[PDB]
Design an enzyme around this catalytic site. Sequence first.
Site, PDB file in Angstrom:
ATOM      1  N   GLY A 185     -23.826  53.346 -31.111  1.00 14.26           N
ATOM      2  CA  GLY A 185     -22.822  52.625 -31.874  1.00 14.26           C
ATOM      3  C   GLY A 185     -21.595  53.462 -32.178  1.00 14.26           C
ATOM      4  O   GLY A 185     -21.673  54.686 -32.274  1.00 14.26           O
ATOM      5  N   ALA A 186     -20.455  52.797 -32.333  1.00 14.25           N
ATOM      6  CA  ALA A 186     -19.202  53.482 -32.626  1.00 14.25           C
ATOM      7  C   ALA A 186     -18.439  52.777 -33.743  1.00 14.25           C
ATOM      8  O   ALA A 186     -18.567  51.567 -33.926  1.00 14.25           O
ATOM      9  CB  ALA A 186     -18.344  53.574 -31.376  1.00 14.25           C
ATOM     10  N   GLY A 187     -17.642  53.542 -34.482  1.00 14.17           N
ATOM     11  CA  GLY A 187     -16.879  52.995 -35.589  1.00 14.17           C
ATOM     12  C   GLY A 187     -15.618  53.784 -35.891  1.00 14.17           C
ATOM     13  O   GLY A 187     -15.306  54.762 -35.212  1.00 14.17           O
ATOM     14  N   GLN A 188     -14.893  53.346 -36.916  1.00 18.83           N
ATOM     15  CA  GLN A 188     -13.628  53.969 -37.298  1.00 18.83           C
ATOM     16  C   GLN A 188     -13.803  55.398 -37.809  1.00 18.83           C
ATOM     17  O   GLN A 188     -12.925  56.239 -37.624  1.00 18.83           O
ATOM     18  CB  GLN A 188     -12.923  53.121 -38.361  1.00 18.83           C
ATOM     19  CG  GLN A 188     -11.518  53.596 -38.704  1.00 18.83           C
ATOM     20  CD  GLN A 188     -10.566  53.501 -37.526  1.00 18.83           C
ATOM     21  OE1 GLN A 188      -9.917  54.481 -37.157  1.00 18.83           O
ATOM     22  NE2 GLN A 188     -10.475  52.316 -36.933  1.00 18.83           N
ATOM     23  N   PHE A 189     -14.930  55.665 -38.463  1.00 23.80           N
ATOM     24  CA  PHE A 189     -15.167  56.969 -39.077  1.00 23.80           C
ATOM     25  C   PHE A 189     -15.941  57.916 -38.166  1.00 23.80           C
ATOM     26  O   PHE A 189     -16.042  59.112 -38.443  1.00 23.80           O
ATOM     27  CB  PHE A 189     -15.916  56.798 -40.401  1.00 23.80           C
ATOM     28  CG  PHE A 189     -15.201  55.929 -41.390  1.00 23.80           C
ATOM     29  CD1 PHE A 189     -15.529  54.589 -41.521  1.00 23.80           C
ATOM     30  CD2 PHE A 189     -14.193  56.448 -42.182  1.00 23.80           C
ATOM     31  CE1 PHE A 189     -14.867  53.787 -42.430  1.00 23.80           C
ATOM     32  CE2 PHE A 189     -13.526  55.651 -43.092  1.00 23.80           C
ATOM     33  CZ  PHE A 189     -13.865  54.318 -43.216  1.00 23.80           C
ATOM     34  N   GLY A 190     -16.483  57.376 -37.081  1.00 20.85           N
ATOM     35  CA  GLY A 190     -17.227  58.174 -36.125  1.00 20.85           C
ATOM     36  C   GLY A 190     -18.157  57.335 -35.274  1.00 20.85           C
ATOM     37  O   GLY A 190     -18.000  56.118 -35.193  1.00 20.85           O
ATOM     38  N   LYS A 206     -25.259  61.290 -36.138  1.00 22.85           N
ATOM     39  CA  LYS A 206     -24.023  60.609 -36.494  1.00 22.85           C
ATOM     40  C   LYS A 206     -22.865  61.595 -36.465  1.00 22.85           C
ATOM     41  O   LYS A 206     -22.811  62.532 -37.262  1.00 22.85           O
ATOM     42  CB  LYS A 206     -24.128  59.956 -37.874  1.00 22.85           C
ATOM     43  CG  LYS A 206     -22.832  59.314 -38.345  1.00 22.85           C
ATOM     44  CD  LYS A 206     -23.027  58.523 -39.626  1.00 22.85           C
ATOM     45  CE  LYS A 206     -23.551  57.126 -39.338  1.00 22.85           C
ATOM     46  NZ  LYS A 206     -23.406  56.222 -40.513  1.00 22.85           N
ATOM     47  N   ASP A 294     -23.037  49.946 -50.227  1.00 21.62           N
ATOM     48  CA  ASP A 294     -22.866  49.166 -49.005  1.00 21.62           C
ATOM     49  C   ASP A 294     -24.201  48.666 -48.460  1.00 21.62           C
ATOM     50  O   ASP A 294     -24.648  49.098 -47.398  1.00 21.62           O
ATOM     51  CB  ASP A 294     -22.146  49.996 -47.941  1.00 21.62           C
ATOM     52  CG  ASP A 294     -21.662  49.154 -46.777  1.00 21.62           C
ATOM     53  OD1 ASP A 294     -21.552  47.920 -46.940  1.00 21.62           O
ATOM     54  OD2 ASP A 294     -21.395  49.725 -45.698  1.00 21.62           O
TER      55      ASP A 294
HETATM   56  F1  LIG Z   1     -27.380  60.169 -39.496  1.00 21.35           F
HETATM   57  C1  LIG Z   1     -27.369  58.912 -39.007  1.00 21.35           C
HETATM   58  C2  LIG Z   1     -27.431  58.709 -37.636  1.00 21.35           C
HETATM   59  C3  LIG Z   1     -27.415  57.398 -37.151  1.00 21.35           C
HETATM   60  C4  LIG Z   1     -27.346  56.268 -37.984  1.00 21.35           C
HETATM   61  C5  LIG Z   1     -27.326  54.863 -37.451  1.00 21.35           C
HETATM   62  N1  LIG Z   1     -26.243  54.002 -37.744  1.00 21.35           N
HETATM   63  C6  LIG Z   1     -26.520  52.831 -37.136  1.00 21.35           C
HETATM   64  N2  LIG Z   1     -27.745  52.842 -36.442  1.00 21.35           N
HETATM   65  C7  LIG Z   1     -28.267  54.164 -36.646  1.00 21.35           C
HETATM   66  C8  LIG Z   1     -29.548  54.643 -36.090  1.00 21.35           C
HETATM   67  C9  LIG Z   1     -29.914  54.223 -34.805  1.00 21.35           C
HETATM   68  C10 LIG Z   1     -31.123  54.652 -34.242  1.00 21.35           C
HETATM   69  N3  LIG Z   1     -31.989  55.480 -34.875  1.00 21.35           N
HETATM   70  C11 LIG Z   1     -31.625  55.882 -36.115  1.00 21.35           C
HETATM   71  C12 LIG Z   1     -30.430  55.497 -36.750  1.00 21.35           C
HETATM   72  C13 LIG Z   1     -28.053  51.524 -35.753  1.00 21.35           C
HETATM   73  C14 LIG Z   1     -26.979  50.476 -36.138  1.00 21.35           C
HETATM   74  S1  LIG Z   1     -25.667  51.324 -37.047  1.00 21.35           S
HETATM   75  C15 LIG Z   1     -27.286  56.545 -39.360  1.00 21.35           C
HETATM   76  C16 LIG Z   1     -27.295  57.840 -39.885  1.00 21.35           C
END
Ligand SMILES: Fc1ccc(-c2nc3n(c2-c2ccncc2)CCS3)cc1
Length: 422
Positions: A185-190, A206, A294
């Site tokens: 996944g991708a977003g504005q903050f990273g 992340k 959130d």
């Molecule tokens: F430090 C982090 C790393 C990944 C995430 C994360 N953010 C999202 N997903 C996941 C995630 C995905 C797969 N395994 C674990 C977390 C899915 C939809 S949006 C959150 C905190």
Amino acid sequence: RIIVVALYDYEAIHHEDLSFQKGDQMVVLEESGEWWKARSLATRKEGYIPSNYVARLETEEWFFKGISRKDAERQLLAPGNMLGSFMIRDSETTKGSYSLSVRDYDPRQGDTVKHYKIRTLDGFYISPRSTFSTLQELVDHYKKGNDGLCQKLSVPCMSSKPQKPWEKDAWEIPRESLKLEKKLGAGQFGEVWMATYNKHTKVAVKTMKPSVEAFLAEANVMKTLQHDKLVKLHAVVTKEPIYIITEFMAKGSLLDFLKSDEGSKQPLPKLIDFSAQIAEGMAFIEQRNYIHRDLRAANILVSASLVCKIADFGLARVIPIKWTAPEAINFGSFTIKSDVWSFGILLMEIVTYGRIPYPGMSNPELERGYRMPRPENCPEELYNIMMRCWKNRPEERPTFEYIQSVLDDFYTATESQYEEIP
Ligand SMILES: Fc1ccc(-c2nc3n(c2-c2ccncc2)CCS3)cc1
Ligand SMILES: [Ca+2]
Ligand SMILES: [Ca+2]
Ligand SMILES: [Cl-]
């Protein structure tokens, strides 16, 4: 001279950790948290072992330590079990005592789990007539015939290998240790990646787009907030861009899973269970006096075994109105009650399988007292919980403790929590 035994099989994957099999005895040399230094009695090698993989009652195949009634109910109804499947556990309301949870069946209700209090003598017994000196005599007895139980005891509940702890002194890790393999996944903050740590541990990273120390401190706050319904924060990379390393959840976000094919096949009690786990996590956040800010199905993760965990709360502070309460929109006042409102909206998401909250409606414009109508498949009382969560006055909204307590025993009357045997 301390001696422990291995409860599960463990293959070493680090520089100084040991490989042992189920039943291997070992000598404890040092107790240092999640990792102990010990010496195997089978290989005579001194190294490191995960604490949660060994015990000095816990050694018994039918005993499960630290688990609640609801947890027992979940683990017993899990695939790989049958009628008569049972377990003995630490009582959740009688501190120092034990309880027996047995899997039963009955038409019109389906697969169920009954719970019996086990009274310790001033021996043990469930029924005053039939008493035993040891728990093993109890289980051996009720394996022969019901004798008052809902069902005859058969095989202990299927044990699950616990989570391999993060390697010692590895809070701050070098970026080279990580291989970010697939962007999730991708977003504005990273962005968010599925990655591998030191070729042995699959994790989720992340990546944060570019204060450093202050954020680092916030992460040090999050690291102490450990709970089974909160995502495990393993490690962090300090040099920019900052990498946040957490446990990997196979089925991703609750939103994507609910909108997925498998999600659409999940029955209503399973959804209630999901929201009960979320409620439990938010209750843990509540007791510690913190705020999520959130709360959505998008910010809830799902493990491979259908376990729902709260992810990345507090990151918001280092920076969704449909999930936001009026007291937080109009005045920027964010409290745990706004998280309760958000939890109501989340409840609606879960029952509607990930559907957008106010479909067809734009963010502007609640003031006319409009609330989402109850879906066809949604229970009236569940909708009642939603409505209780959506209250104009924040102080008149239920606690996460109460919500969790209601959702957990949603299909069970208070009197029917523990079976009574004369
Ligand atoms: F430090 C982090 C790393 C990944 C995430 C994360 N953010 C999202 N997903 C996941 C995630 C995905 C797969 N395994 C674990 C977390 C899915 C939809 S949006 C959150 C905190
Ligand atoms: Ca009803
Ligand atoms: Ca009862
Ligand atoms: Cl020795």
